[PDB]
Design a protein around this ligand. Structure first.
Ligand SMILES: [Mg+2]
Ligand SMILES: [Mg+2]
Ligand SMILES: [Mg+2]
Lengths: 52, 72, 64, 332
RNA sequence: AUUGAAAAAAAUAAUAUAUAUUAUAUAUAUUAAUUAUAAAUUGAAAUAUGUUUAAUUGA
RNA sequence: GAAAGAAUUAAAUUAAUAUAAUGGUAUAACUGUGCGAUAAUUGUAACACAAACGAGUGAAACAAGUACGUAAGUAUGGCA
RNA sequence: GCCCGGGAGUCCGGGCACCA
């Protein structure tokens, strides 16, 4: 069987999505401003283990 | 959120445990070198606790006491 | 007449769009909103291109 | 020159570091380059000296019942630069006798003022917002700070901020209190009690909640400088209800653990009181009623709050408790 | 740290570095910056290098 | 006896509310300001009011993420 | 909404879809 158009273009789509995800936070930061970015960076640095 | 960040947390915990074990081993080795009597495991644990206390803000005697009390 | 509709596409390429209305002059809109496919907030950007009522870039660097 | 003298006046009123004192009287910024860079304001010396002379004179003039006397002393001292330096730039929590004596009245006053400025206010806010006061004990009037700590479990060092979320691990073993008294009270004869209550445990019969007393100390002796309530001090005779840890059931909200500190009623020596340790029902416990019975006056309080987590089962097991109930996620 | 002036340390907070814990803690050090941001032949200032004069100083 | 602070009482009200009229509003919804452009987000919405049906209205709670907030919390566009 | 005629912008007149 040949496979449906949507079924063959699935892997590629997934890959694209993944790529987007990888480069989304940065985009958001850009949209926001520098202060937001700085804050995010600070948060990342923080070093604080939670609990479950 | 918990589900997401649970595996990571677990990993971290494991790492910490490993580190602790290593420290304990080191302490044991030191003790051996010194030549002191030892129960030995317990002693090592106590030592580790004391060290931890020291690392955090505690007067040394007080820290030791605290460690002892935990065990008790 | 004044208010046109526009389609905002998720910057994460899940193909989840959302629509809003704006004035014809309105600046190039973006907004971060929840994308149910990716299940997290993402920037949504205008899909179709459209002319914008140009505003002068305000000068912070004391020119002339 | 009364502030120069140290016969009757305690030694704590001076700056213990000599260099600093010297600098003051005619600096600290450690780095040499930084020091070089620094440039103080002109004519500070002579004017400062004059000011000192003035204030010293005032103090001398001031210098001459107990509370009144204490107040007078405080008034005399406060403007001393040295004392100010000591108080401002040295830690008040883990106090060091010679730098800041809370035996000395001025220092005590300063501490009180500091507390009023921030920590006390914070505590009050936490009490009000979280509905600690009206829910457990009608009201309080701050009087003394109460800082808790959980040193034994885990092993780390941290003073708990009021109204925090503590992990079940952290609150697995008992806490340590530091009841920092002020207000010219007796030290030999005055005893204290401390009660850790949690008012929100699920009552299924009524469908409401009931208040459990998870930890209870009575007849504790305190001192202005020596106020850490460690197992060293209290002994097993003073515990009315031995420590039980927070073990919130799943989906039973956020349980508020609110530590209350009361001072005993005062009648020669230290007046004790029996409290029928066996008879007193701890599983369900009336705080107000208890207070009425023994005529306590709640001086100070602190609070934290616990939630369910994976760790609590283990804690329960350790303590040898039931497996713990589980509640529906819906507030039906 | 080297230049100036003439043993150490004991707050808060900020920053740098480390580590403790299914605890955004602690230990050590130091207290920066506080209205700034591209593009100016003639505006002004400073420094370095020459010449002159009352080894140097001023100009 | 003075200074300063915290205020409290009285008056609050037709000013203001994106917009008619009404009801509300100083405990401010009205005004100023910091941060923020995020709740003018995403699945389930019980139950009410209203209601012939088609429709409409308020909305607890569950779950996913976001903003501000020391915290309590607050935000599913606009005082109605 | 798209295409003309009088680099961008405004202001006017033609068409071309939409017309359930
Ligand atoms: Mg009106
Ligand atoms: Mg509003
Ligand atoms: Mg109906």
């Amino acid at each position: 069987p040949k496979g449906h158009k949507h079924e063959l273009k699935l892997n590629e789509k997934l890959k694209k999505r993944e790529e987007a995800l990888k480069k989304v936070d940065e985009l958001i930061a850009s949209k926001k401003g520098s202060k937001y970015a700085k804050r995010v960076e600070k948060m990342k640095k923080n070093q604080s283990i939670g609990w479950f | 959120k918990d589900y997401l960040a649970k595996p990571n947390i677990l990993k971290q915990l494991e790492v910490r445990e490993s580190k602790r074990k290593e420290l304990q081993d080191k302490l044991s080795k030191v003790l051996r070198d010194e030549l002191k009597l030892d129960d030995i495991e317990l002693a090592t644990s106590y030592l580790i606790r004391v060290r931890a206390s020291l690392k955090n803000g505690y007067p040394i005697e007080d820290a030791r006491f605290n460690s002892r009390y935990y065990l008790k | 007449s004044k208010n046109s509709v526009i389609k905002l596409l998720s910057t994460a390429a899940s193909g989840y769009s959302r629509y809003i209305s704006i004035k014809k002059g309105a600046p190039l809109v973006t907004q971060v909103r929840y994308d149910p496919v990716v299940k997290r907030h993402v920037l949504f950007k205008e899909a179709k291109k459209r002319k914008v009522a140009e505003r002068k870039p305000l000068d912070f660097l004391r020119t002339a | 020159h009364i502030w120069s003298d140290f016969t009757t006046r305690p030694s704590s009123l001076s700056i213990q570091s000599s260099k600093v004192k010297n600098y003051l009287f005619q600096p600290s910024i450690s780095r040499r380059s930084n020091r070089i860079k620094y440039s103080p304001p002109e004519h500070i010396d002579e004017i400062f000296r004059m000011s000192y002379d003035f204030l010293e004179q005032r103090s001398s003039k001031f210098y001459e019942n107990p509370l009144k006397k204490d107040a007078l002393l405080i008034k005399a001292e406060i403007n001393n630069p040295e004392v100010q330096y000591n108080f401002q730039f040295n830690n008040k929590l883990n106090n060091v006798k010679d730098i800041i004596d809370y035996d000395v009245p001025v220092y005590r006053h300063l501490g009180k003022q500091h507390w009023e400025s921030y920590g006390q206010m914070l505590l009050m806010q936490r009490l009000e917002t979280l509905a600690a006061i009206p829910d457990t004990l009608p009201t309080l009037v701050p009087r003394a700070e109460v800082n808790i700590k959980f040193p034994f479990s885990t092993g780390v060092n941290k003073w708990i901020e009021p109204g925090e979320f503590l992990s079940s691990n952290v609150t697995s073993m008992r806490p340590i209190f530091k009841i920092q008294e002020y207000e010219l009270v007796n030290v030999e004869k005055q005893l204290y009690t401390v009660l850790i209550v949690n008012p929100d445990v699920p009552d299924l019969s009524n469908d409401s909640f009931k208040t459990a007393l998870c930890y209870g100390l009575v007849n504790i002796n305190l001192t202005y400088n020596d106020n850490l309530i460690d197992p060293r001090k209290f002994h097993s005779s003073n515990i009315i209800a031995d420590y039980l840890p927070p073990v919130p059931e799943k989906n039973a909200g956020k349980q508020r653990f609110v530590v209350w500190v009361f001072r005993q009623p005062l009648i020669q020596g230290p007046n004790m009181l029996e409290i029928d340790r066996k008879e007193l029902s701890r599983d369900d416990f009336d705080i107000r009623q208890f207070t009425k019975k023994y005529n306590l006056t709640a001086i100070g309080a602190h609070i934290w709050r616990s939630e369910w987590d994976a760790k609590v089962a283990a804690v329960r097991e350790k303590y040898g408790l039931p497996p713990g109930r589980v509640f529906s996620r819906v507030r039906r």
